[PDB]
Symmetry: none
Subunit: 322 residues, 2 copies
């Protein structure tokens, strides 16, 4: 009900694309202060923001309700820590912290002080994932029985950490944490030193324990597997991959093949647009209206636990129970 | 020169998979057909002799080969009777009710110097034959991944892992050998279902290619079908949809003799996306025709020309070992090491 005065820690790509346009347009937030080291780039589009020269200046201002930590990766633990100690709610960009221990510390500190600690991941707000969420919300496939998600690439010259994070994040958000993890990893390309292939099964996710989950990525898929393939009792949705913050061109549309009002339909499906402002609207609804936050920092720790369970599964040739 | 053949039953399997090929192959005579009460074979095979019992096949001194395609419970007894009587034998799946019975039959046939084959016809599906061709020609470069799936959609109502998984596992073993370990996850995804109607199986480190990633899958709830095959290599990929058309044509009563038998259209062919002499190509791959007659042609080449038998009964025992490991992996929530 009171406007969330927001300090933005950096005005590089991420500040200009992921953060400032939505803090600005959202009427429940004020783009109040922006850190720029020497430049005044933000003046042109955001003339009512005040430019400060240092991060500490955001933490020392009692008017600030929220600090967005989108500075370089190495600064994240220190900066989020400074902001929380100063009594500010915090958004940190992925990667949240350099260690799990650090992440646990910050969550505990936020809990102690009654503050929000959110982790920003732009892919949560992309057209493709939101379209999948919407298909599920509307039960277009009937009762869902299978979910598959693959990052297909073709490149010669670790994947489970780099692309697995996004896939695991999205699966946990839709279906909850699994009882167990199977993973098989590969180094498929000659001369490779880190995994360039994985397949992961999340066994019995808490919200939908009967749904079969497959997460995959590979650098040797010259013909791509689907970015999403979903199967239900009434139908299927299959989507192939190419920020993704608007609508999608026809070439990118998924195929929806299902039963609607008792009639079989099989058509390319435009889906719904990306909604990068959704991140901030959810923060508003959480802080002001007490609604569930979709981006709690504990999510990231949960993804890391799954990533580690996947590497353990492969290394030990075992199903890892959680 | 000519293999005199007795067919143990003229039910569906008899009319679809066996009689049309034993008949059209010039190296076989469809000599005798067991029909216990009917005379259904007279219309299409009027030169065959109808007998009323299985014993009339095994006691026939002029029969070289007996095809055991009777109801499932007889198969051990019937194959044993045929072997003891000195005949070469084909058994349909299920080979035997137990593994011990199967091992017994294999040893008996070996002792007597008799052929014991198990009918596994999907080795001659158009799609799989085409896969063998692509691999033979190294079109994908070095293969790194093999996915094989039977996608079905039937949202209403022994398991799928036995019924369809047997075919997929057999194919995978033929190409890549036996795995070191098995992971499987099975499901009953349909309301009211009594047996598994979904499986995913990983055959981990197959002997002949231990770095190739293997996924075998089937489901009765895939309204939009996943590929029948998706193979990936260093240079490219091959992706195929659909199923072999032979069984439908044979069920309709089409005679398999003709030049275009087992052929697929350009639409049915798989997509090959790879590098051929330096250049990227992406096009439908003119495939190998489906050839269920190849099962019998192989039997002839084995018995008459001393060539290797492709379909040893031991192959199905190997397949069953994998199936049992898949069931154990699912039931016990563990990777099963062989
Ligand atoms: Mg205020």
């Amino acid at each position: 009900l009171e406007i969330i005065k927001t300090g933005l820690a950096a005005f590089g790509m991420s500040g200009q694309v992921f953060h400032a346009p939505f803090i600005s347009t959202n009427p429940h937030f004020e783009l109040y202060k922006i850190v720029e080291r020497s430049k005044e780039l933000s003046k042109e589009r955001y003339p009512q923001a005040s430019i400060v020269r240092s991060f500490k200046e955001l933490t020392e201002d009692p008017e600030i309700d929220l600090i967005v930590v989108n500075t370089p990766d190495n600064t994240h633990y220190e900066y989020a820590g400074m902001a929380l100690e100063a009594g500010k709610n915090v958004v940190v960009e992925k990667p949240f912290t350099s260690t799990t221990k650090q992440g646990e510390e910050l969550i505990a500190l936020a809990k102690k002080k009654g503050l929000m600690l959110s982790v920003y991941q732009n892919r949560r707000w992309d057209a493709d994932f939101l379209t999948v969420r919407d298909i599920l919300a509307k039960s277009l496939l009937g009762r869902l029985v299978e979910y598959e998600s693959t990052f297909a690439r073709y490149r010669n010259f670790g994947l489970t950490y780099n692309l697995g994070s996004h896939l695991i994040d999205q699966a946990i958000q839709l279906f909850g944490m699994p009882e167990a993890v199977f993973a098989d990893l590969g180094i498929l390309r000659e001369g490779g030193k880190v995994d360039d292939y994985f397949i992961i099964h999340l066994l019995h996710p808490s919200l939908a324990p009967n749904v079969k989950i497959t997460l995959k990525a590979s650098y040797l898929m010259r013909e791509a597997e689907p970015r999403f393939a979903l199967h239900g009792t009434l139908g299927s949705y299959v989507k192939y991959g190419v920020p993704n913050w608007g609508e999608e061109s026809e070439q990118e549309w998924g195929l929806l093949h299902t039963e609607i009002n008792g009639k079989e339909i099989c058509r390319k499906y435009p889906g719904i647009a990306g909604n990068y402002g959704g991140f901030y609207q959810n923060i508003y609804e959480h802080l002001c209206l007490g609604q569930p936050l979709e981006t709690h920092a504990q999510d990231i720790l949960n993804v890391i636990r799954i990533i580690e369970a996947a590497y353990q599964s492969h290394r030990e040739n075992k199903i890892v129970n959680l």
